[model samples]
Target: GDADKIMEQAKRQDPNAQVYKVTTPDEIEEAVRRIEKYGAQVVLIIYTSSGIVILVAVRDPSQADQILKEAKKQNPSATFVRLEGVSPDDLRRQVEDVWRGSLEHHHHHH
Candidate 1:
């Protein structure tokens, strides 16, 4: 999958790239539940006043699209950036574009 290749390339470039296995919403919910069940912060949702951006990774781009659809239903403002089988450099460039746009918006309000 492209994610595996991206991890491989990232590791070659920087061993501490911090790669994680792609997870589903169920897994995320379970993890959050476990944390709360263990007396952790019980906040229903954590967010930065600045805003929150979530990046979901899937083995296949088609699955990612479906996930994005569901996410949009839940949060109409949700944004998705797709990188279908792209390389690490390509993915980085895409992320940079998002970051640049976010920065532009951040400053525009001022």
Candidate 2:
């Protein structure tokens, strides 16, 4: 799947970045709230046919567990994966490109 591939690449790319897969709008919202609590900023939101893929950056690696725990508690079905080695600046650059591509694609559809 494209989402899986993206997650794999993202994990290998950054230590400060975490990718989250939440299967519903409600779960995505819940997960974001929990993520915010730990000071992790969501850099991008990718929409998939099955769910949403989120990219979070500027986080404390130590707080990853707490964020995951609370996020899971709120939305048990949400998926969370933390990857190693991407800085906020690097992640932002990648995310912006994808974001622009998504925007253009959606506009074309409409």
Clashes of each: 0, 6
Which residue pairs in candidate 2 collide?
Answer: 14-84, 14-85, 14-86, 15-84, 15-85, 15-86
Alpha-carbon error at 18 in model 1, in Å? 11
Report the number of the highest-TM-score candidate.
1
List ranges where model 2 is wrong by over 4 Å. Answer: 38-42, 59-110
Model 2: worst 10 consecutive residues (lDDT sum): 37-46
Which portions of model 1 show Cα errors greater than 4 Å? 1-51, 106-110
TM-score of each: 0.44, 0.42
TM-score of 1: 0.44
Residue 96, candidate 1: Cα error in Å is: 1.8
- In angstroms, the error of model 2 at 30 is 2.3
